């Protein structure tokens, strides 16, 4: 197994312009959406076929009721936050919780809040304490840190429950999440502005999206490499690239994907 992850996001919007839910929730395994809920449908629904086929209807019924509750919690906290800040009008409140299971056997877990899309409160499950970015966050910090049992509960959830959900969903979606589609890599040479040769090394067709690409001179490290984003091709695979300039030493593109290494010599 490669590194895998489970993440749940919440998004609250006070005073939303028509057509924007006041509350949206979405879970992910790796890059794949698995679950969704919002304040318009007021239902938690699967977003992936392997989630729908493996989780009985009483699962979605139970989490429908909790998200309804959690939407009301988010509405009320946003109101208090705005009161602390003395903010009128429309503002956003966000939460991310999740965990990772890396190849190493070692795990991670995290829990974070943002207000207006900036860091607000960061939980440390190893010291069981919240980090506050300012004095309003410091007030909430004191409230949450005074409930000792609640911090122990979060630590337990990140370290045991979250990892066990992830292992469950990996088995459900293993045919999607554990597969490998290797990349197609090509190198393109071209003289650009007079006397400037750009080399592009370009990859597509691959999955998982994680991929390593770099340029090397004579077999040792490279100058300034330009990196293209890993982008979804819309068919379940990904694409990316890396480029350098030379002018006229000989170069090679090096690609790493799912434990297979590739060299393209220019």
């Amino acid at each position, epitope marked *: 197994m490669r590194t895998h992850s489970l993440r749940y996001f919440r998004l609250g919007v006070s005073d939303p312009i028509h057509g924007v839910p006041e509350f949206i929730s979405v879970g992910y395994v790796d890059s794949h959406p698995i679950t969704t809920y919002d304040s318009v449908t007021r239902q938690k629904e699967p977003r992936a076929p392997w989630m729908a086929e493996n989780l009985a209807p009483d*699962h979605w*019924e*139970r*989490y*429908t*009721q*909790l998200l*309804r*509750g*959690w939407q*009301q*919690m988010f509405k009320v906290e946003l109101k208090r936050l705005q009161r602390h800040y003395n903010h009128s009008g429309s503002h956003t409140y966000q939460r991310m919780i999740g965990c990772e299971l890396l190849e190493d056997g070692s795990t991670t877990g995290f829990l974070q809040y943002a207000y207006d899309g900036q860091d607000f409160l960061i939980f440390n499950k190893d010291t069981l304490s919240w980090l506050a970015v300012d004095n309003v966050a410091h007030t909430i910090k004191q409230a949450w840190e005074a*409930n000792q*049992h*609640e911090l*122990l*509960y*979060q*630590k*337990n*959830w990140l370290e*045991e*429950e979250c990892i*066990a*959900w992830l292992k469950r969903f990996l088995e459900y979606g293993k045919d999607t999440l554990q597969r490998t589609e290797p990349p197609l890599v090509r190198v393109n040479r071209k003289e650009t502005f007079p006397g400037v040769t750009a080399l592009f090394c370009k990859a597509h067709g691959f999955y998982p999206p994680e991929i390593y690409m770099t340029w090397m001179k004579n077999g040792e490290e490279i100058q300034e490499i330009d990196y293209g984003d890993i982008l979804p091709s819309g068919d379940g695979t990904y694409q990316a690239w890396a480029s350098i300039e030379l002018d006229p030493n000989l170069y090679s593109c090096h690609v790493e994907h799912s434990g297979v290494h590739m060299v393209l010599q220019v």
Partner: antibody
Amino acid sequence: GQNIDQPTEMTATEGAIVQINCTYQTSGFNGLFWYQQHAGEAPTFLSYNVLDGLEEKGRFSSFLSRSKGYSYLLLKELQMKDSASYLCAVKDSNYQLIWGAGTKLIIKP
Amino acid sequence: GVTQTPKFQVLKTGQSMTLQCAQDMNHNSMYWYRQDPGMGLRLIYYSASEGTTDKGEVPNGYNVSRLNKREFSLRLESAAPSQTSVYFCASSVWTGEGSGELFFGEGSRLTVLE
């Protein structure tokens, strides 16, 4: 989850110690609660454990081993007052409470 | 904290009745349990927050109304001798908060006779 197990009844002598066991086998774990319910009255919250160890509140203590799926409520210096039922309850992976059938504790003078 | 009525009720078979429960603790979640000899509490219906309800373990022969944030009624549609029991209303700050305890009302003893 499926099962919570705790003895039906327990008798101990006033001034001594008693340990009420609770084994749980659930699907996921999010906490173990102990409640006290006097005869003909409502249950009231005694303790909460979610990580391993022993929490002590006065003459009462509650223990949890998450790997043995196991908790006990410990009562020291028993008093007649302590006669009541003791409810064991576990939150499962979907935050539902699975309740044990309770342990009636009898104090002999 | 939690107020529940009535404490005791005799009913004839086929009669209806409503149990009332009110909490003024600004709690979001309320529950209706029945307690029967030799078994754990069984959750009939619950309300994870104002504006929503769902069945519990033994909903048949009951329904509920979360009237407002404070109040959670339980109705016996057509009292059966099997519904002879002690009924507990309970509330808690939220649902899905791991360490939140329940706060119970005093109980309603109901006996249904032919």
